[PDB]
């Protein structure tokens, strides 16, 4: 079978980004030893090791949706993957408010129409299990108390 490739964006500190960029544009396999990525079983934490120097990483959710588009003639572009995550290196914390481009900054706060967390469904599933495992349930919409 075929599995859709999973592309994400890696953001590095600027000096480390310059060393990684120089090693990528060089093209040797020396970069392969120099740059490693360890993703922790949290799923939202990691180390990126540039030249064997550890950097602390967080995999965050991006507010917009990006799409990689490949081409052979620079006139027709074929969509290859959807990018929604970024492993910035240096829950609410794992959500990025800004977009990658310069015009998109504070997009989630200003350029996004109010949208719901769809979280609440999981919380309701937790309450329903407790109700069904009980015997007697008493409910009242309340006031200030």
């Amino acid at each position: 079978p075929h599995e859709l490739e999973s592309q994400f964006i890696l953001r590095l500190p600027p000096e480390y980004a310059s060393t990684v960029r120089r090693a990528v544009q060089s093209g040797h396999v020396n970069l392969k030893d120099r740059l490693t990525i360890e993703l922790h079983p949290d799923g939202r934490h990691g180390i990126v090791r540039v030249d064997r120097v550890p950097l602390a990483s967080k995999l965050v959710d991006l507010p917009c949706v990006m799409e990689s588009l490949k081409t052979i003639d620079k006139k027709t572009f074929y969509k290859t993957a959807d990018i929604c995550q970024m492993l910035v290196s240096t829950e609410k914390k794992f959500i990025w408010n800004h977009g990658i481009t310069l015009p998109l900054k504070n997009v989630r706060k200003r350029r996004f129409r109010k949208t719901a967390k769809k979280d609440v469904e999981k919380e309701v599933k937790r309450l329903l299990s407790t109700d069904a495992e009980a015997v007697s349930t008493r409910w009242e919409i309340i006031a200030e108390d």
Partner: peptide
């Protein structure tokens, strides 16, 4: 402007009948 409070009755191991009153202050839940 009204919160939701739920009372739950359950039986503990051996013999017990504890009752849990839980208040949900989130209008979404």
């Amino acid at each position: 402007g009204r919160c939701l409070k739920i009372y739950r009755t359950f039986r503990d191991e051996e013999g017990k009948e504890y009752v849990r009153c839980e208040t949900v202050r989130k209008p979404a839940v």
